[PDB]
């Protein structure tokens, strides 16, 4: 086969078959690796619905933020780019979800996208993630060569 700088620098990137099956069992395990995490955005940005996937990952950031100054500026980021109407990122969330947001930028909490979070992970935990799982693309992640 090939050792070359081109190919090696590819293969680098895959995680092993052994670490993409474990990815069947929990989404968060999925999640939690960062291959994992790489591998079901692609899949996700092939069917055009990636942004599900970024607002997540957006507000988990935006979870971990202890700073009352830059917790207000990244509501109003996040909302820029996944929330307000014609965003390019855009989610489906309800109106009113969308309402109480942009009320509560001001004054942001940690849990400012809490409820349209769980309406997004739970939307990909029953549905974008079974369907990862039965993806050709996935089902070669976990074979085992030769």
């Given at each position: 086969?090939?050792?070359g700088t081109e190919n090696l620098y590819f293969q680098s990137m895959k995680p092993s078959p052994e670490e993409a099956q474990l990815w069947s069992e929990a989404f968060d395990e999925l999640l939690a690796s960062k291959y994992g995490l790489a591998a079901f955005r692609a899949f996700?940005?092939?069917?055009?619905?990636?942004?599900?996937?970024?607002?997540?990952?957006?507000?988990?950031?935006?979870?971990?933020?202890?700073?009352?100054?830059?917790?207000?500026?990244?509501?109003?980021?996040?909302?820029?780019?996944?929330?307000?109407?014609?965003?390019?990122?855009?989610?489906?969330?309800?109106?009113?979800?969308?309402?109480?947001?942009?009320?509560?930028?001001?004054?942001?909490?940690?849990?400012?996208?809490?409820?349209?979070?769980?309406?997004?992970?739970?939307?990909?935990?029953?549905?974008?993630?079974?369907?990862?799982?039965?993806?050709?693309?996935?089902?070669?992640?976990?074979?085992?060569?030769?």
């Open positions: 086969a090939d050792l996700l940005k092939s069917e055009f619905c990636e942004e599900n996937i970024e607002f997540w990952l957006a507000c988990e950031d935006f979870k971990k933020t202890k700073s009352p100054q830059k917790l207000s500026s990244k509501a109003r980021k996040i909302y820029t780019d996944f929330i307000e109407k014609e965003a390019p990122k855009e989610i489906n969330i309800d109106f009113q979800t969308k309402t109480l947001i942009a009320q509560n930028i001001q004054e942001a909490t940690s849990g400012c996208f809490t409820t349209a979070q769980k309406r997004v992970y739970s939307l990909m935990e029953n549905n974008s993630y079974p369907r990862f799982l039965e993806s050709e693309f996935y089902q070669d992640l976990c074979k085992k060569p030769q």
